[PDB]
Design a protein around this ligand. Structure first.
Ligand SMILES: COc1ccc(Cc2nnc3sc(-c4cc5ccccc5[nH]4)nn23)cc1
Length: 273
């Protein structure tokens, strides 16, 4: 009953069950949409396997297979729908920077943001809008390479604390990361991803502080419309805060592209020893 065209299209993405061992005995992540487990891929390859709840839309998900970039979470393959992802040793970026045992420098933190910018520049060039860019939704591998994650079949609410439900609709949205226009229309664009990226930069430069702590969530609109923005973090260089303010331009079309952001951030990064 499957579209035969869809069938032969996904072959380059399908992983044979004889080639994947899933270690269900070790839960590494619980999500709203499924659990992540350790896995072995056949040489032997260590991976994370996400097991979704409750078919054609799953196999169509292989738009994800066609995304390949050093700073974007790759899809190893698919095989209960099994999402086979590369193992990310150092977990989500927000938890990593909040970890007191780790000691990233200012240059390192700016480096993490430059990596996210490159990943988004890639995603944007494929006309992919993320809609939930945040430090909690980026991951770090064993070489401390940052991967924009939490998209496609990997999409989930990995920290429910930061999603609030709207009235007219039912949507639980990451309001503290959303652009003004998205708060008002609930539509998302690459330029609204740029707003979120500005917030992510602030997260990095505060080592994972929650944005707008006092503010009670969906009235963030009123807060911003008072003429407000997140404050400059103590160790944030002045030009990087100017970049943040640009990311939060009132007019979406006046915000920088991710291409411009990679360019500007690479220059700032380069001034550090
Ligand atoms: C250990 O390696 C992985 C690899 C992929 C995944 C699934 C995934 N894809 N994108 C994202 S963001 C994310 C995440 C987990 C988490 C836990 C606490 C707070 C924030 C979090 N984000 N997980 N994830 C989970 C663990």
């Amino acid at each position: 009953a499957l579209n035969p065209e869809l069938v032969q299209a996904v072959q380059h993405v399908v992983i044979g069950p004889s080639s994947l061992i899933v270690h269900f005995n070790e839960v590494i992540g619980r999500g709203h949409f499924g659990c992540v487990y350790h896995g072995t891929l056949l040489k032997k390859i260590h991976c994370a396997v996400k097991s979704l709840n409750r078919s054609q839309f799953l196999t169509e998900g292989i738009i994800m297979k066609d995304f390949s970039h050093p700073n974007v979470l790759s899809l190893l393959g698919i095989c209960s729908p099994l999402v086979v992802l590369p193992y990310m040793k150092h977990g989500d970026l927000r938890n990593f920077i909040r970890n007191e045992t780790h000691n990233p420098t200012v240059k390192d933190l700016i480096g993490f943001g430059l990596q996210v910018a490159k990943g988004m520049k890639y995603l944007a060039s494929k006309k992919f809008v993320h809609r939930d860019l945040a430090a909690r939704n980026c991951m770090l591998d064993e070489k401390f390479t940052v991967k924009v994650a939490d998209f496609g079949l990997a999409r989930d609410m990995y920290d429910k604390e930061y999603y609030s439900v709207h009235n007219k609709t039912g949507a639980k949205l990451p309001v503290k990361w959303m652009a003004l226009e998205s708060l008002q229309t609930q539509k998302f664009t690459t330029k609204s991803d740029v707003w979120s990226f500005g917030v992510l930069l602030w997260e990095l430069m505060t080592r994972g502080a929650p944005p707008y702590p006092d503010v009670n969530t969906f009235d963030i609109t009123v807060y911003l419309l008072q003429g407000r923005r997140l404050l400059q973090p103590e160790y944030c260089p002045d030009p990087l805060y100017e970049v943040m303010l640009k990311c939060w331009h009132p007019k979406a079309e006046m915000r920088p592209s991710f291409s411009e952001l990679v360019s500007r951030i690479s220059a700032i990064f380069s001034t550090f020893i």
